[PDB]
Design an enzyme around this catalytic site. Structure first.
Site, PDB file in Angstrom:
ATOM      1  CB  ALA A 204      -0.819   3.752  15.379  1.00  0.00           C
TER       2      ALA A 204
ATOM      3  CE1 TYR B 160       0.163  -2.234  11.878  1.00  0.00           C
ATOM      4  CE2 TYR B 160      -2.170  -2.757  11.898  1.00  0.00           C
ATOM      5  CZ  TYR B 160      -1.088  -2.137  11.310  1.00  0.00           C
ATOM      6  OH  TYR B 160      -1.254  -1.412  10.152  1.00  0.00           O
TER       7      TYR B 160
ATOM      8  CD  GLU C  19      17.526  16.343  33.400  1.00  0.00           C
ATOM      9  OE1 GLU C  19      18.346  15.537  32.909  1.00  0.00           O
ATOM     10  OE2 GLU C  19      17.235  16.364  34.614  1.00  0.00           O
TER      11      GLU C  19
HETATM   12  N1  LIG Z   1       3.295   0.080  14.869  1.00  0.00           N
HETATM   13  C1  LIG Z   1       1.972   0.124  14.741  1.00  0.00           C
HETATM   14  N2  LIG Z   1       1.427   0.815  13.687  1.00  0.00           N
HETATM   15  C2  LIG Z   1       0.088   0.881  13.531  1.00  0.00           C
HETATM   16  C3  LIG Z   1      -0.761   0.257  14.429  1.00  0.00           C
HETATM   17  N3  LIG Z   1      -2.029   0.494  14.021  1.00  0.00           N
HETATM   18  C4  LIG Z   1      -1.996   1.249  12.895  1.00  0.00           C
HETATM   19  N4  LIG Z   1      -0.685   1.487  12.579  1.00  0.00           N
HETATM   20  C5  LIG Z   1      -0.164   2.275  11.454  1.00  0.00           C
HETATM   21  O1  LIG Z   1      -0.840   3.522  11.406  1.00  0.00           O
HETATM   22  C6  LIG Z   1      -1.152   3.869  10.066  1.00  0.00           C
HETATM   23  C7  LIG Z   1      -2.663   3.977   9.899  1.00  0.00           C
HETATM   24  O2  LIG Z   1      -3.178   4.885  10.844  1.00  0.00           O
HETATM   25  P1  LIG Z   1      -4.144   4.443  12.052  1.00  0.00           P
HETATM   26  O3  LIG Z   1      -3.544   4.854  13.377  1.00  0.00           O
HETATM   27  O4  LIG Z   1      -4.492   2.976  12.033  1.00  0.00           O
HETATM   28  O5  LIG Z   1      -5.457   5.312  11.738  1.00  0.00           O
HETATM   29  P2  LIG Z   1      -6.143   6.288  12.812  1.00  0.00           P
HETATM   30  O6  LIG Z   1      -5.106   7.067  13.592  1.00  0.00           O
HETATM   31  O7  LIG Z   1      -7.054   5.494  13.713  1.00  0.00           O
HETATM   32  O8  LIG Z   1      -6.919   7.334  11.863  1.00  0.00           O
HETATM   33  P3  LIG Z   1      -8.262   6.910  11.073  1.00  0.00           P
HETATM   34  O9  LIG Z   1      -8.555   5.443  11.268  1.00  0.00           O
HETATM   35  O10 LIG Z   1      -8.096   7.231   9.610  1.00  0.00           O
HETATM   36  O11 LIG Z   1      -9.383   7.748  11.649  1.00  0.00           O
HETATM   37  C8  LIG Z   1      -0.571   2.784   9.181  1.00  0.00           C
HETATM   38  O12 LIG Z   1       0.687   3.191   8.696  1.00  0.00           O
HETATM   39  C9  LIG Z   1      -0.422   1.605  10.113  1.00  0.00           C
HETATM   40  O13 LIG Z   1       0.624   0.762   9.701  1.00  0.00           O
HETATM   41  C10 LIG Z   1      -0.222  -0.446  15.500  1.00  0.00           C
HETATM   42  O14 LIG Z   1      -0.958  -1.012  16.308  1.00  0.00           O
HETATM   43  N5  LIG Z   1       1.150  -0.509  15.651  1.00  0.00           N
END
Ligand SMILES: Nc1nc2c(ncn2[C@@H]2O[C@H](COP(=O)(O)OP(=O)(O)OP(=O)(O)O)[C@@H](O)[C@H]2O)c(=O)[nH]1
Ligand SMILES: Nc1ncnc2c1ncn2[C@@H]1O[C@H](COP(=O)(O)OP(=O)(O)CP(=O)(O)O)[C@@H](O)[C@H]1O
Ligand SMILES: Nc1nc2c(ncn2[C@@H]2O[C@H](COP(=O)(O)OP(=O)(O)O)[C@@H](O)[C@H]2O)c(=O)[nH]1
Ligand SMILES: COC(=O)Nc1nc2ccc(C(=O)c3ccccc3)cc2[nH]1
Ligand SMILES: [Ca+2]
Ligand SMILES: [Ca+2]
Ligand SMILES: [Ca+2]
Ligand SMILES: [Cl-]
Ligand SMILES: [Mg+2]
Ligand SMILES: [Mg+2]
Ligand SMILES: [Mg+2]
Ligand SMILES: [Mg+2]
Ligand SMILES: [Mg+2]
Lengths: 421, 61, 329, 439
Positions: D12, D224, D254
């Protein structure tokens, strides 16, 4: 590169395993020679998960194991028999006589080190090994006895790798010998300890589906196996094709297994095989007990977790809507203490001969019905120590059976704990 | 309803509109990280010990 | 199939509503803590509004407006009327009231002194005291509000007895305001004595039950009879002399708080049934006494009202396969 | 001029980070190869945009960014993406296998073996800074890396950079767009471990972005990619003061000063308007009063909650486009007489306002339409505690049965850390309440 290493042990294990490789080899465009002849690069994006790349040839990362040569000789001459690496055929000559002790302690012990040498060579050539999958039955001797011996050896050498199994549970309806409840009871405890996922494929369910739903008056093992290979294809779809999910075995298990011992899944498939099914029909079928391959009534228990993958072109706003309607229909059959425990995923590529399909993976407490069934058949003979001489003659003790019986009853009571919670 | 601290530039302006007046150390981090790695090592050793007891039984059979 | 949960077992009104929903066959009750519901018949206190409207694909409805307590608590109502320009301290249909903590102690006495040669009788409540002397009222308290007692109530004959009017008002998810055509008068069986004895001053159903039942069944006179009495005795109708003021007061109160409680564009929807308590003086002026956020109904009117709730508040959002007066605004 | 280093953790964080830097380049006129024609000080300079971009002798403008993920698939999309030339290898850090949605795996198991590397690559960027303000950290609550490794990183950044401020952009878990069930555990675990180390955190609930994409962009099933382009716009509105000439929120300090009076209550609510579909051939451009009024409609908030039933501690209005103070004050006066806006008795009832004349930039071929004026409101309201209540309740349901707990204990975590984090959240919920609050 998220490699998976496949092992198939014994008659049943090698026959469903062979069909599994036939099915996905076709889905990935690999021909019986190992040469690619597809029309989409999506077929090759995750080819390395299950195939090694040789002359632009793709070789299954598969190890074929048995204590007699018959079934593997038949695989080597089968349709896709030539794609398997010849060195990965590891077989003895004495057989296991449908005897768990022969597979686990005597005949199998003499062959296991040779199998692990091939497993090691395949694991060594893995950039990043996800884990292992095993195909086998629990009612025989090689797949059940030696298969669970292999699982114990693999966990000792690879304690941080996922171990999943596709395990065919015996049924008197579709039986080879009367000792199958002994072999299954002994094997289940091994799986309770040393697997992260076990797909419970009940031959009773596969038979009922072939007879009552598919209108096959006399099902064969081949007919039962078409259901298994199709289910295995769907269960591994998210690992083999690009799409919504890109989770490895560990992440998939984390979200499906809330308690370490309750990792025995009820798989399902729809449509059960010219009129393409509507999304409401796919969704209603994959939750119907008649489409489930464990011969357990989900209405007699509760779902801890559910995962379902839909394959093909379809409106997913329509799937989300139907998944809500079926959950409302079965609202009292989902635990209320795991929020959002029903998850859905999509893949654009459908399987051969279908415009769309759905695969069901349920972690339900109703699976205890299957273990209770096996435990009752076990006790019916063990009260009188019937057929035990086949096992004591291989060095086993009565106490080991008593302990397996108690372990089975503990597993069943643990399911009943969370079905009332 | 007064405006105060009005700043203007070529890119924009800013102001305020008032409507009414009214840590752990590196050592301690490495400690907790190492304490978790040793709980992993202990649990893994219990598994291998459990499996070693299974090997004993296999030889006895 | 629609789903709903019940979290106030002590509610007679919504105990009948749940029974009616189940009797349609298209509604299925779940367990108290099951979050996958369409309709919540929530509890009175600490309703978890923050957890509503966050279940994917589920349209969720609750039988309470978050923030309506500002109208249904006696101290909050006084503050709401005096501080809201829509209502203002110059409000003509709400008795002179003051909030006193065990505040408005100095200003209450200032108006109390200005009265001293007006009649100077007050009532304090949150547990009720009526006294002519302020010190007895202020010292009695030791959160309450002191309210001017209406010394010239309209007294029904025969009986020379007091009463109050209960009106049931349903506000749906679109903030339509519905006045149940049927009200009820909670009458006093004892004669009103202007000269400590609270049998003829307090008109609560429980205070009278504890001459009861002499004039009418259960000290509950309904609009048909009370109307006919006003035509025979005072040559007027219930509509002209009282209901016009009641409807005006109901609308004023609810439109004042609309921006604070409306669920127009919220991720969840609210409706709620209110119990307005009025008093009529001998000049046929209507005064607002209080608003109840969780009121009961009259035994005769449970069936008709509860059915109305389902038709207008529930089935309006979750359709299946008038007794209300719509106060337009 | 003082620099800011952006850190993107997990899928994410990385994908959102990639969408923000794309937008940054378009706003500043930077091309995919890194060249900026309007910049005349070749190979150097202390302009406002240099807070986020360094400069090479060849004229390339390099983001002060570090991407970290425990598996390579997502960061590989950056290495081969449109803006590949923009970064260099030392900025992209990948592991071999991920945390599998397991906080314990991201914080303890895999985090210990990569934390030193990440800090080194961060030190390399910090060494090029004449006056570092601090860090902007992008991550999810639900991911094992986004949650587990981020909390560990924040701990070490407070050690190696005790004076620098740290701001978060956190993705709050929504089951609509998630195939996991353990995210309530990871959210509470990472919030507990990161609270002391974060000065100001902007939570974004995927539920809210999802519905805004459905309702206002006519996207039936937002992906996404759809969510991130909208999130990047809002992040840009928040960081624009750091990248352009101005006087409001010109340094990370700030943000705390203007938005966080009480340190633990450092989660401002973001509200953005207008979001207009690009498929709409023509749309009636909204006035300053209309977009400002839209900042108080729950449907436009980054987290769905009801500020009417809470209290404000601070409120900042950030306008981009054709906006002048006159129209802003006119709108505020009108909105006070129609909306329930209650401040705490120990704060002023006012609005800090910033205007940047450049209108919002949109990605060519995206889903958002160009608008002549837009606004992002940053309000620290206690109503955002509804998001903690939701999350803490999901935590309670599972933890009462110890569901999934064995996965965390198996990686070295102790069961006591669960209750330790949950009790911290229970105190957080009470802090918000102290500040905000048959007949
Ligand atoms: N808004 C948004 N949410 C995302 C995205 N990718 C993953 N998520 C959210 O992040 C959560 C899952 O965590 P991720 O960030 O994909 O996993 P990670 O941080 O890579 O951790 P691990 O894969 O377990 O090692 C879920 O709630 C997803 O809906 C994105 O590109 N945009
Ligand atoms: N200012 C006033 N003037 C005249 N009578 C009053 C009065 N305030 C209260 N009363 C009388 O005392 C009775 C009880 O007072 P009040 O209505 O505040 O108690 P309560 O809140 O318990 C009613 P409910 O049982 O519906 O909740 C009223 O019904 C009314 O008859
Ligand atoms: N589904 C299926 N089940 C089989 C097949 N062959 C054997 N079985 C089942 O497996 C059990 C016998 O085990 P088997 O695999 O033949 O013994 P093994 O070779 O020693 O492992 C019985 O319960 C059979 O019903 C097969 O091809 N398909
Ligand atoms: C070789 O062994 C395995 O394939 N194991 C395995 N476990 C799984 C668990 C889930 C899924 C899914 O398809 C899925 C669908 C919707 C949401 C989330 C996941 C697939 C799995 N495969
Ligand atoms: Ca031999
Ligand atoms: Ca320059
Ligand atoms: Ca600090
Ligand atoms: Cl420092
Ligand atoms: Mg056989
Ligand atoms: Mg050897
Ligand atoms: Mg009352
Ligand atoms: Mg990841
Ligand atoms: Mg602790």
């Amino acid at each position: 590169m998220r490699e998976i290493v496949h092992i198939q042990a014994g008659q049943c294990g090698n026959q469903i395993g062979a069909k599994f490789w036939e099915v996905i080899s076709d889905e990935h465009g690999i021909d019986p020679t190992g040469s690619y002849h597809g029309d989409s690069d999506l077929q090759l994006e995750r080819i390395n998960v299950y195939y090694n790349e040789a002359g632009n040839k793709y070789v299954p990362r598969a190890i074929l194991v048995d204590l007699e040569p018959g079934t593997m000789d038949s695989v080597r001459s089968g349709p896709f028999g030539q794609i398997f690496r010849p060195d990965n055929f590891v077989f003895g000559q004495s057989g296991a006589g449908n005897n768990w002790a022969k597979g686990h302690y005597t005949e199998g012990a003499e062959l296991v080190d040779s199998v692990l040498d091939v497993v090691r060579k395949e694991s060594e050539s893995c950039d990043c090994l996800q884990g292992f999958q095993l195909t086998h039955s629990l009612g025989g001797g090689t797949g059940s006895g030696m298969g669970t011996l292999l699982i114990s050896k693999i966990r000792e050498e690879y304690p941080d790798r996922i171990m999943n199994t596709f395990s065919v549970m015996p049924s008197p309806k579709v039986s080879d010998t009367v000792v199958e409840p002994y072999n299954a009871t002994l094997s289940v405890h091994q799986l309770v300890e040393n697997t992260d996922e076990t797909y419970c494929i009940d031959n009773e369910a596969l038979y009922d589906i072939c007879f009552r739903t598919l209108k096959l008056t006399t099902p064969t093992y081949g007919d039962l196996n078409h259901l298994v290979s199709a289910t295995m294809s769907g269960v591994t779809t998210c690992l083999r094709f690009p799409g919504q999910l890109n989770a490895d075995l560990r992440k998939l298990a984390v979200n499906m297994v809330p308690f370490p011992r309750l990792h025995f899944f009820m798989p399902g498939f729809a449509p059960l095989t010219y009129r393409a099914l509507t999304v409401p029909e796919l969704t209603q079928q994959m939750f119907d007990s008649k489409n489930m391959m464990a011969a357990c009534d989900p209405r007699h228990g509760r779902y801890l977790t559910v995962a379902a993958i839909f394959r093909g072109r379809m409106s997913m706003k329509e799937v989300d809507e139907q998944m809500l309607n079926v959950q409302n229909k079965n609202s009292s059959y989902f635990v209320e203490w795991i929020p959002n425990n029903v998850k859905t995923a999509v893949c654009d590529i459908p399987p051969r001969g279908l415009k769309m399909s759905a695969t069901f993976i349920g972690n339900s407490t109703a699976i205890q019905e299957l273990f209770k069934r096996i435990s009752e058949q076990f006790t019916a003979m063990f009260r009188r120590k019937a057929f035990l001489h086949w096992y004591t003659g291989e060095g086993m003790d009565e106490m080991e059976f008593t302990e397996a019986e108690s372990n089975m009853n503990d597993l069943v009571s643990e399911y009943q704990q969370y079905q009332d919670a | 309803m007064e405006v105060i601290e009005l700043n203007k530039c070529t890119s924009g302006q800013s102001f305020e509109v008032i409507l009414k007046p009214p840590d752990p150390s590196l050592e301690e981090i490495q400690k907790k990280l190492e304490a978790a790695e040793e709980r992993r090592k202990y649990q893994e050793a219990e598994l291998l010990k459990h499996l070693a007891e299974k090997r004993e039984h296999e030889r006895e059979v | 199939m629609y789903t709903f949960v019940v979290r106030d077992e002590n509610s007679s009104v919504y105990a009948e509503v749940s029974r009616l929903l189940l009797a349609t066959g298209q509604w299925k009750r779940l367990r108290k803590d099951n979050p996958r519901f369409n309709l919540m018949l929530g509890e009175r206190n600490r309703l978890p509004f923050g957890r509503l409207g966050h279940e994917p694909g589920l349209v969720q409805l609750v039988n309470y407006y978050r923030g309506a307590d500002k109208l249904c608590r006696k101290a909050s109502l006084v503050k709401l009327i005096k501080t809201s320009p829509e209502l203002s301290e110059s409000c003509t249909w709400f008795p002179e009231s003051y909030v006193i903590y065990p505040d408005e102690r100095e200003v209450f006495l200032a108006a109390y002194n200005r009265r001293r040669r007006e009649g100077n009788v007050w009532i304090a409540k949150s547990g009720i005291l009526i006294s002519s002397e302020a010190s007895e009222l202020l010292d009695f308290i030791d959160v309450h509000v002191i309210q001017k007692y209406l010394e010239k109530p309209l007294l029904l004959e025969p009986g020379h007895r007091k009463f109050d009017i209960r009106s049931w008002v349903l506000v749906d998810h679109l903030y339509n305001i519905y006045l149940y055509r049927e009200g009820v008068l909670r009458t006093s069986s004892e004669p009103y004595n202007s000269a400590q004895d609270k049998t003829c001053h307090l008109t609560n159903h429980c205070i009278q039950k504890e001459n009861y039942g002499r004039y009418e069944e259960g000290n509950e006179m309904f609009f048909e009879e009370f109307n006919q009495y006003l035509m025979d005795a005072l040559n007027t109708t219930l509509e002209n002399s009282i209901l016009l003021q009641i409807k005006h007061i109901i609308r004023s109160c609810l439109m004042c708080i609309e921006p604070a409680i409306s669920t127009k564009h919220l991720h969840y929807q609210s409706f709620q049934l209110f119990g307005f308590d009025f008093m009529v003086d001998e000049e046929l002026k209507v005064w607002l006494i209080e608003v109840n956020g969780a009121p009961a109904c009259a035994q005769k009117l449970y069936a008709e009202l509860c059915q109305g709730i389902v038709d207008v508040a529930i089935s309006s959002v979750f359709p299946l396969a008038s007794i209300f007066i719509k106060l337009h605004h | 001029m003082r620099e800011c280093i952006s850190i993107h953790v997990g899928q994410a964080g990385v994908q959102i980070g990639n969408a923000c830097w794309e937008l940054y380049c378009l706003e500043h006129g930077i091309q995919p190869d890194g060249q900026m024609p309007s910049d005349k000080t070749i190979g150097g300079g202390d302009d406002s945009f240099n807070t986020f971009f360094s400069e090479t002798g060849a004229g390339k403008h390099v983001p002060r960014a570090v991407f970290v993920d425990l598996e390579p698939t997502v960061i590989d999309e950056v290495r081969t993406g449109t803006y590949r030339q923009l970064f260099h290898p030392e900025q992209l850090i990948t592991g071999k296998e991920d945390a599998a949605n397991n906080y314990a795996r991201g914080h303890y198991t895999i985090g210990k073996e990569i934390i030193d590397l990440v800090l080194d690559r961060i030190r390399k960027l910090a060494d090029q800074c004449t006056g570092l303000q601090g860090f902007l950290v992008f991550h999810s609550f639900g991911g094992g890396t986004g949650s587990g490794f981020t909390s560990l990183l924040m701990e070490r950044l407070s050690v190696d950079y005790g004076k620098k401020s740290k701001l978060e952009f956190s993705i709050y878990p929504a089951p609509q767009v998630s195939t996991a069930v353990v995210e309530p555990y990871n959210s509470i675990l990472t919030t507990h471990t990161t609270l002391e180390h974060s000065d100001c955190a902007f939570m974004v609930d995927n539920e809210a972005i999802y519905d805004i994409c459905r309702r206002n962009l006519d996207i039936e099933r937002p992906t996404y990619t759809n969510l991130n382009r909208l999130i990047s716009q809002i992040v840009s509105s928040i960081t624009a003061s750091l990248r352009f000439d101005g006087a409001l929120n010109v340094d990370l300090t700030e943000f705390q000063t203007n938005l966080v009076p009480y340190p633990r209550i450092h989660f401002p609510l973001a509200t953005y308007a207008p979001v207009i579909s690009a498929e709409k051939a023509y749309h009636e451009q909204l006035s300053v009063a209309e977009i400002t009024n839209a900042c108080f409609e729950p449907a436009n908030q980054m987290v769905k909650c009801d500020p009417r039933h809470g209290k404000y501690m601070a409120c900042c209005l950030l306008y981009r486009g054709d906006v002048v103070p006159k129209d802003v004050n006119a709108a505020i006066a009108t909105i006070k007489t129609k909306r329930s806006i209650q401040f705490v008795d120990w704060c002023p009832t006012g609005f800090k306002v910033g205007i940047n004349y450049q209108p919002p930039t949109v990605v060519p071929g995206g889903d958002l339409a160009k608008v002549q004026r837009a606004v992002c409101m940053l309000s620290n309201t206690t109503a955002i505690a509804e998001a903690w209540a939701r999350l803490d309740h999901k935590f309670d349901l599972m933890y009462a049965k110890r569901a999934f707990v064995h996965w965390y204990v198996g990686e070295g975590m102790e069961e006591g850390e669960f209750s330790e984090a949950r009790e911290d959240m229970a105190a957080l919920e009470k802090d918000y309440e102290e500040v905000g609050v048959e007949e």
